[PDB]
Write a protein that binds this ligand. Structure first.
Ligand SMILES: CCCCCCCCCCCCCCCCCC(=O)OC[C@H](COP(=O)([O-])OCC[N+](C)(C)C)OC(=O)CCCCCCCCCCCCCCCCC
Ligand SMILES: CCCCCCCCCCCCCCCCCC(=O)OC[C@H](COP(=O)([O-])OCC[N+](C)(C)C)OC(=O)CCCCCCCCCCCCCCCCC
Ligand SMILES: CCCCCCCCCCCCCCCCCC(=O)OC[C@H](COP(=O)(O)OCCN)OC(=O)CCCCCCCCCCCCCCCCC
Ligand SMILES: CCCCCCCCCCCCCCCCCC(=O)OC[C@H](COP(=O)(O)OCCN)OC(=O)CCCCCCCCCCCCCCCCC
Ligand SMILES: CCCCCCCCCCCCCCCCCC(=O)OC[C@H](COP(=O)(O)OCCN)OC(=O)CCCCCCCCCCCCCCCCC
Ligand SMILES: CCCCCCCCCCCCCCCCCC(=O)OC[C@H](COP(=O)(O)OCCN)OC(=O)CCCCCCCCCCCCCCCCC
Ligand code: SF4
Ligand code: SF4
Ligand code: SF4
Lengths: 110, 70, 176, 381, 156, 97, 80, 311
């Protein structure tokens, strides 16, 4: 309840600040402006590379999602199995990175 | 010279000092002169609810010692 | 008579290779750059307190124009038009006639300070030290035509600034 | 299809980029944004009157362009400056070289992102502008180096201050070089960037560091020497890979060698006059203008008509800090030039910008526009 | 009256905040840019006056035209001036920006930047010294100090 | 310890401007509070100070008057308020006041 | 094994440090004598309740009180 | 009462962000051999107030936007996430004491890229969208090493509790067993906030007016101060006497200010990375060492019998 009140208060303060920033300078009457970029009028071409680094983030973030219960997993009584699977998951994250390296995947966003 | 930056760092340091000082003194005010009860786990919450039940005044921070038993 | 910048071969013993790997992994030259910036943090800055402190100038400085007078009140300018003949910007416009006592004097002496390139050929062409480019550099205006000086403005600049112009010419005329 | 950007004028430069994603396929620099028609205005003004235009071409290399124009006019006049004027010209030419290389290195670091050695080295540049103001009266455009010598003798105590500056300036070069040379981020922005082969550098009309970064052993102060550069002792830095990093190191070492030359010029300044003692070219003293009849006539005729230059064409090139700075001066026998073509190195360098930025990226274009020290005043005239 | 006093104090406050936080957009056209950079250098140091170094044009308070304005770049000058939000100010710096200068009779030079944009402060020189440019910027700040927007608004 | 001498010099800069009142006066009008040898004063109230321990550029300065020619220059200090006999000295065109 | 290692430590020392730290992380727990005590501490941490036994009559090795000698002891955890 | 505690958190955040701009201009003054602001206020103390009033009465830039919703929600999300990263921070006691404050801060810092993405699409400029996508790709790149370094340090903590992270460092700073993690964490938080030498946006929100641009600016500096406080708690955690919390408050305040000055002292020292160079820095330099040290910090509390306590 305290956390929800804190989130509500921070959202309310942010909304009030954006409200002041979009209402206070509008009350100046200065002048209307007539006839209100490097590219002229062209379509943004889709780049393969930005999408590749986005999907690479998504897959390694899933591997991070698997790695996140390790500070709780180190408390177990099957420590040989736990250490084996922890080293196996970090090794599979590293093998994903090595395959992303060696097949020209990290190129011009290296 | 280089000590002219220190009024700004002093004002910024007082502004970083106010939140922790505020929450420490407010926790000692709202909990009967003591720290706020940290209940991350359900056993700690269970003993905290038992405190609130044994105090009689619906306050977990009113302590009852050996004066309450016969 | 020539030297090769950037024609050093790095060593390949284990010592220097480990030195370069320690420089890579421990960021040693980046700490060197942080140390140089930290060194300048604890220096006195070079900042003078303008308007209360002024940058140092010389007596040769070429600022705002002025028309000087002799030590009898007679103005030095005798309308010879050397200064508008040598003016590389053609910022000077002079018209003259004999006045009531027969003296060769100007009726128009205009310097468009927005055309002027402030190079001081007019003061070094002037055979009688009449036009000088004095010490004033703080004469910014809010209007364009305020930087179009006629003879009255330049004579008032001379009357305003003569106490300093004469001392600068006294300090500098032996180099001229 | 491929991308086409217009990095407009929001000096100044318009750039039309044909990109292929991150790469640069074509770089078209639209220039002329500071074309003022200097070398047409020179045609209606006398030689003394055309002198201050040269201050404003390479407006960080003022007394160098003054020196090149003065050498062109003195070559057509068949007269020579006195020795003291020559040592003063070489002294202030190397001070001008320090000015231009501080401007070059610190703005080339400012555009890439290292904004701090800018502020560190413009205090030294402020002190050298005080040297210009003490010698001539203006901080940038002095109109000091004139055909015949210089305008006015050094004020007393100026050389002691040039000594006190030159004694301390190598530590300033050392702390600039501490911030940038071994810095891995500065090396990653300049090592693989704009590699220019020596044959294409000779073919494209490149000059100065743009040649010497590519290993060509050419400096006009050595090979085609002017005023007293055959009497000073200095070394010429030579690159190895033709990239932005070697050109950076060449400019830092040219600051070192300019300090060496300034020390030698302070220790070897001769006594004597500072103008040519032909009063039909250089004006007489003001003490003898106001006493002698011939000197008053010569003062009148030099500051109204000017000296007549004999008819002829010359191409006088000096080693400005940006490279070979040339003046092709055509005289028809009058006291005004018939023609004055101004060769400046930045024009051919900015012409070679398109080859230098092939296969590179968009943030390498600012590094290549930095390694060619491009002042658009000398490019557009 | 009370409301006159209130709008006078409010004019003093907003004039203080607009002159003590000037952000310049500097046109580095020609040699005057070098002396603007000396006005930003550690000796004269614009930043201690609240005058920041190289703000973007869409949030700047003053356009410093520093150098020759040619015919080829006069629409770019007016376009960057039109992109500036109000209150925008223009400082003309040096002779070519002021009246054409040494290129006044040129075919390809706009004879003064006040044929293009409205100019508040004319700083003369070739180039004006960095101390002289700073004098012009402080005179601009004094011109902002005696503005009367809310006093005239209450009187209109 | 030499921090103590730094603190003593700051406290006698407070003492040198005539106390805290003159200290705050020069602090808010000048943005600089260091004391110097009073070299002179013109016919308007501009006071002219030296300190040859400072570096070259700081070693001569002026405190402008509060009222010159009918204008309240308490806050509106102006560079052109210096009369020309002090303009060679203040801009270091000569050594002589 | 000596020229290849020097070549990769001169070219790519980041990868050499990576594979060296990862190799130590793989092989070194199988050589450490302290690794047994990780398991012995984790089995000694009583999250639950030690539910007592019914005494049938023949259990000498189970205590009847916490302060009795027989049973598991943590003197090694104190001393180590 | 609790609302007073929320306000005494979130109002001095905005005041410290206001004066971080002054401290930045002064420190980058004196590190560049000049002075910072000293005319506007006494020692320049009125520079943030004058700056804020200048930005708040400026003419609105009046943009043509692709969306109204994202153009308004991007400053609101930026400020809300900038203020809600402070609530689990132990200083010595947090506002919201929770079991998973580290994972909470990691999640709410991962959510901050929507402000960049929404403000880039909500502008009609294609170059603004390219710069915003490059900034989003940079931020999601360095969030990977944030997560893995954070996981490796919490392998020494014992839980996701931020108050346990003060108990963890009672005998030693946690920069001593984890200084490669600490230096890669420091450069990774430097590259999260688009801070120099990773500030490619100064070498994505050019359509906002001066007010909302100041709001993005102050959310960014709230992130800078917050990540410095979080780095202080996580690697340089101070002594905590429970009877006098002002000792820990003064101590982590001084360390956090020195670390923010270290941000200011790094931006005054280095040129900018080109974009593929810091992509090379993450994916090919920081990430292999981060994975190798993650394996080391898994296997090391087991091989030393130093597994930290669960509670
Ligand atoms: C909390 C964070 C900081 C918040 C902002 C700082 C605090 C101060 C807020 C009030 C500032 C003063 C009012 C806004 C600025 C007005 C400037 C201006 O140009 O006004 C002229 C304008 C218009 O005046 P005008 O009619 O002369 O317009 C001139 C322009 N022409 C003629 C071309 C159209 O005035 C107003 O719009 C009046 C606004 C309210 C006046 C003050 C009332 C009390 C406010 C409190
Ligand atoms: C939290 C408090 C502060 C913490 C410290 C941070 C403050 C200091 C910051 C200094 C300024 C930094 C500014 C930004 C710099 C960014 C550039 C940079 O540094 O790039 C990183 C550079 C990048 O490399 P590079 O670009 O310099 O080199 C060339 C790289 N290749 C070959 C790929 C082209 O280095 C790293 O990535 C190293 C990261 C840290 C490594 C830590 C290793 C510790 C030692 C482990 C053991 C090693 C021995 C071998 C095995 C032994 C086993 C027993
Ligand atoms: C009914 C009656 C009341 C009506 C409403 C008004 C309420 C109070 C509002 C604040 C004060 C208003 C007056 C403002 C100052 C007026 C006088 C002035 O401008 O003095 C100038 C003086 C500096 O003089 P200067 O010319 O700069 O000299 C340079 C020296 N070399 O300036 C100075 O010495 C310092 C000036 C400081 C100005 C005040 C502080 C700023 C405003 C603070 C409150 C608003 C902002 C709150 C925070 C915003 C978000 C961060
Ligand atoms: C068994 C231990 C645990 C192993 C698994 C865990 C690993 C943790 C770290 C994860 C790393 C993820 C990414 C790995 C990528 C490796 C491949 C690679 O990078 O190859 C390319 C590289 C040459 O680079 P190039 O492609 O040319 O790039 C141009 C740049 N100028 O090629 C090279 O530079 C050569 C790289 C391969 C050889 C490295 C040898 C290091 C040896 C260190 C000492 C022994 C360590 C123990 C392991 C046995 C090694 C044989
Ligand atoms: C957690 C703490 C956070 C603190 C944040 C703020 C830190 C800095 C605080 C300010 C420090 C001192 C500032 C002094 C400014 C100068 C005052 C002054 O003298 O202004 C003069 C001006 C004109 O006066 P005039 O009548 O012309 O007098 C000439 C005499 N011949 O007269 C005026 O301008 C009128 C008076 C205006 C006074 C304004 C003072 C500054 C207000 C800043 C807003 C924030 C205040 C603190 C809020 C939080 C703490 C409670
Ligand atoms: C585009 C729209 C506008 C965008 C701006 C506003 C939204 C974005 C910024 C705010 C984000 C809000 C995130 C809300 C949940 C945060 C996670 C959380 O609550 O974790 C803390 C805690 C878990 O720790 P633990 O210690 O186990 O709990 C106490 C038990 N001893 O858990 C608890 O203590 C549980 C407390 C009660 C549950 C709290 C739930 C809050 C309301 C739901 C989310 C509201 C926001 C929805 C939109 C999100 C963004 C799209
Ligand atoms: S200084 Fe030069 S441009 Fe100016 S009026 Fe004199 S001669 Fe003409
Ligand atoms: S100012 Fe001098 S040069 Fe010009 S017309 Fe007068 S006397 Fe002749
Ligand atoms: S007024 Fe003169 S010095 Fe200034 S920019 Fe123009 S040409 Fe250059």
């Amino acid at each position: 309840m305290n956390l929800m009140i804190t989130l509500l208060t921070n959202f309310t303060l942010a909304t009030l600040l954006v409200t002041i920033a979009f209402w206070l300078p509008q009350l100046n009457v200065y002048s209307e402006k007539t006839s209100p970029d490097p590219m002229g009028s062209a379509r943004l071409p889709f780049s393969m590379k930005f999408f590749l680094v986005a999907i690479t983030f998504l897959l390694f973030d899933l591997e991070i999602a698997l790695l996140l219960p390790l500070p709780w997993a180190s408390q177990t009584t099957n420590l040989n199995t736990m250490l084996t699977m922890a080293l196996l998951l970090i090794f599979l994250l590293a093998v994903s990175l090595a395959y992303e390296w060696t097949q020209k995947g990290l190129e011009w966003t290296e | 010279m280089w000590f002219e930056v220190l009024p700004g760092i002093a004002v910024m340091g007082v502004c970083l000092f106010i939140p922790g000082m505020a929450t420490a003194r407010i926790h000692r005010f709202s909990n009967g002169g003591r720290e706020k009860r940290v209940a991350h786990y359900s056993y700690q919450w269970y003993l905290m609810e038992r405190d609130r039940r044994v105090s009689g005044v619906n306050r977990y921070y009113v302590s009852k010692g050996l004066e309450n038993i016969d | 008579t020539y030297k090769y910048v950037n024609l050093r071969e790095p060593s390949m013993d284990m010592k220097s290779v480990t030195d370069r790997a320690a420089q890579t992994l421990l960021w040693t030259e980046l700490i060197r750059g942080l140390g140089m910036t930290l060194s300048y943090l604890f220096r006195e800055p070079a900042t003078i307190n303008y308007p209360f402190e002024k940058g140092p100038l010389s007596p040769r400085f070429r600022g705002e124009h002025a028309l000087r007078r002799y030590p009898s009140g007679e103005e030095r300018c005798i309308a010879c038009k050397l200064c508008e003949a040598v003016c590389p910007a053609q910022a000077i416009t002079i018209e003259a006639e004999p006045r009531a006592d027969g003296s060769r004097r100007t009726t128009r002496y205009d310097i468009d300070m927005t055309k002027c390139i402030y190079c001081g050929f007019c003061q070094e062409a002037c055979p009688v030290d009449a036009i000088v480019e004095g010490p004033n550099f703080e004469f910014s205006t809010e209007t364009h035509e305020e930087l179009l000086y006629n003879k009255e403005k330049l004579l008032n600049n001379g009357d305003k600034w003569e106490a300093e112009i004469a001392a600068n010419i006294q300090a500098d005329y032996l180099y001229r | 299809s491929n991308l086409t950007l217009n990095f407009g004028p929001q000096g100044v430069l318009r750039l039309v980029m044909e990109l292929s994603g991150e790469m640069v396929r074509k770089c078209d620099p639209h220039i002329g944004l500071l074309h003022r028609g200097t070398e047409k205005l020179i045609e209606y003004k006398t030689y003394l009157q055309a002198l201050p235009y040269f201050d404003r071409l390479d407006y960080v290399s003022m007394m160098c362009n003054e020196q090149a124009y003065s050498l062109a006019v003195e070559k057509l006049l068949n007269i020579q400056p006195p020795p003291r004027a020559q040592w003063i010209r070489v002294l202030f030419g190397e001070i001008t070289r320090l000015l231009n290389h501080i401007m070059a290195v610190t703005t080339h670091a400012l555009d890439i992102g290292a904004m701090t050695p800018f502020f560190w080295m413009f205090e030294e540049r402020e002190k050298m502008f005080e040297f210009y103001e003490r010698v001539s009266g203006a901080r940038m455009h002095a109109a000091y180096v004139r055909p015949g010598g210089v305008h006015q003798d050094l004020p007393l105590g100026l050389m002691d201050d040039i000594y006190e500056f030159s004694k301390n300036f190598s530590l300033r070069i050392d702390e600039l070089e501490e911030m940038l040379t071994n810095n891995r981020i500065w090396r990653n922005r300049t090592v693989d960037i704009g590699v220019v082969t020596a044959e294409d550098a000779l073919n494209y009309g490149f000059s100065g560091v743009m040649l010497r970064g590519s290993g060509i052993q050419w400096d006009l102060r050595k090979t085609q020497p002017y005023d007293v550069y055959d009497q000073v002792e200095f070394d010429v830095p030579i690159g190895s890979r033709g990239d932005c990093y070697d050109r950076y190191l060449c400019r830092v070492e040219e600051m070192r060698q300019s300090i060496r030359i300034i020390s030698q010029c302070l220790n070897k300044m001769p006594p004597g006059e500072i103008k040519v003692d032909d009063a039909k070219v250089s004006p007489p003293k003001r003490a003898e203008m106001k006493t002698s009849m011939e000197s008053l006539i010569h003062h009148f005729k030099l500051y109204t008509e000017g000296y007549q230059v004999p008819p002829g064409a010359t191409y006088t090139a000096i080693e400005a800090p940006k490279g070979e700075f040339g003046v092709y001066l055509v005289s028809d026998g009058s006291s005004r030039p018939y023609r004055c073509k101004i060769k400046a190195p930045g024009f051919a360098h900015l012409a070679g910008l398109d080859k230098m930025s092939k296969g590179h990226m968009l943030a390498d274009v600012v590094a290549i526009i930095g390694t060619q020290d491009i002042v658009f005043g000398e490019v557009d005239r | 009256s009370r409301g006159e006093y209130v709008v006078a104090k409010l004019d003093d406050l907003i004039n203080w905040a607009r002159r003590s936080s000037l952000w310049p957009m500097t046109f580095g056209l020609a040699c005057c840019a070098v002396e603007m950079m000396h006005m930003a250098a550690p000796r004269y140091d614009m930043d201690r006056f609240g005058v920041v170094f190289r703000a973007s044009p869409r949030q700047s308070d003053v356009m410093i035209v520093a150098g020759t304005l040619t015919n080829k770049m006069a629409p770019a000058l007016r376009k960057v001036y039109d992109q500036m939000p109000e209150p925008r100010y223009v400082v003309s710096m040096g002779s070519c920006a002021n009246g054409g200068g040494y290129y006044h009779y040129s075919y390809s030079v706009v004879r003064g930047c006040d044929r293009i944009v409205p100019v508040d402060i004319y700083v003369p020189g070739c180039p004006p010294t960095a101390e002289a440019l700073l004098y012009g910027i402080l005179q601009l700040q004094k011109k902002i100090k005696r503005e009367k927007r809310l006093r005239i608004w209450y009187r209109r | 310890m030499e921090l103590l001498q730094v603190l003593k010099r700051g406290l006698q800069q407070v003492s040198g401007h005539g106390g805290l009142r003159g200290y705050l006066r020069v602090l808010f009008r000048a943005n600089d509070v260091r004391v110097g040898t009073l070299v002179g004063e013109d016919k308007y109230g501009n006071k002219y100070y030296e300190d040859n321990k400072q570096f070259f550029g700081r070693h001569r300065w002026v405190i402008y008057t509060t009222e010159m020619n009918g204008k309240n220059t308490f806050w509106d200090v102006d560079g052109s308020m210096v009369p020309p006999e002090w303009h060679r000295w203040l801009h270091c065109m000569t050594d002589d006041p | 094994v000596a020229a290849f290692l020097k070549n990769v430590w001169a070219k790519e020392p980041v990868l050499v440090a990576s594979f060296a730290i990862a190799g130590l992380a793989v092989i070194l727990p199988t050589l450490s004598p302290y690794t047994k005590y990780s398991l012995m501490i984790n089995r000694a941490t009583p999250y639950n309740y030690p539910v007592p036994l019914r005494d049938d009559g023949n259990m000498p090795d189970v205590p009847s009180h916490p302060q009795d000698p027989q049973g598991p002891s943590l003197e090694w955890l104190k001393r180590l | 009462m609790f609302m007073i505690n929320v306000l005494t958190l979130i109002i001095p955040i905005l005041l410290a962000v206001a004066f971080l701009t002054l401290v930045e201009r002064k420190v980058l003054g004196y590190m560049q051999f000049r002075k910072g602001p000293n005319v506007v206020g006494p020692y320049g103390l009125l520079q943030p107030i004058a700056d804020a009033i200048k930005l708040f009465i400026k003419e609105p830039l009046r943009p043509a936007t692709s969306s109204i919703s994202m153009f308004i929600l991007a400053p609101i999300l930026a400020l809300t996430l900038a203020l809600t990263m402070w609530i689990p921070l132990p200083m010595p006691y947090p506002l919201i004491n929770m079991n998973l404050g580290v994972l909470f801060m990691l999640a709410m810092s991962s959510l901050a890229v929507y402000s960049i993405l929404w403000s880039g699409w909500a502008s009609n400029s294609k170059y603004a969208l390219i710069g915003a996508l490059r900034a989003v790709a940079q931020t999601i790149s360095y969030e990977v090493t944030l997560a893995i370094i954070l996981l490796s340090v919490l392998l020494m903590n014992g839980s996701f509790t931020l108050s346990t992270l003060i108990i963890t460092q009672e005998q030693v700073w946690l920069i001593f067993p984890a200084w490669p993690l600490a230096m890669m964490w420091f450069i990774s938080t430097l590259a999260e906030t688009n801070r120099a030498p990773f500030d490619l946006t100064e070498g994505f929100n050019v359509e906002y007016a001066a007010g909302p641009f100041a709001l993005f600016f102050m959310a960014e500096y709230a992130n800078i101060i917050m990540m410095n406080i979080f780095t202080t708690t996580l690697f340089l955690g101070a002594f905590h006497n429970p009877y006098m919390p002002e000792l820990y408050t003064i101590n982590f305040t001084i360390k956090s200010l020195l670390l923010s000055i270290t941000f200011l002292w790094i931006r005054a020292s280095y040129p900018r990375f080109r974009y593929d160079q810091l992509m090379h820095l993450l994916w090919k330099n920081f990430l292999p060492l981060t994975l190798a040290l993650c394996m080391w910090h898994v296997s090391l509390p087991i091989l030393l019998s130093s597994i930290p306590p669960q509670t």
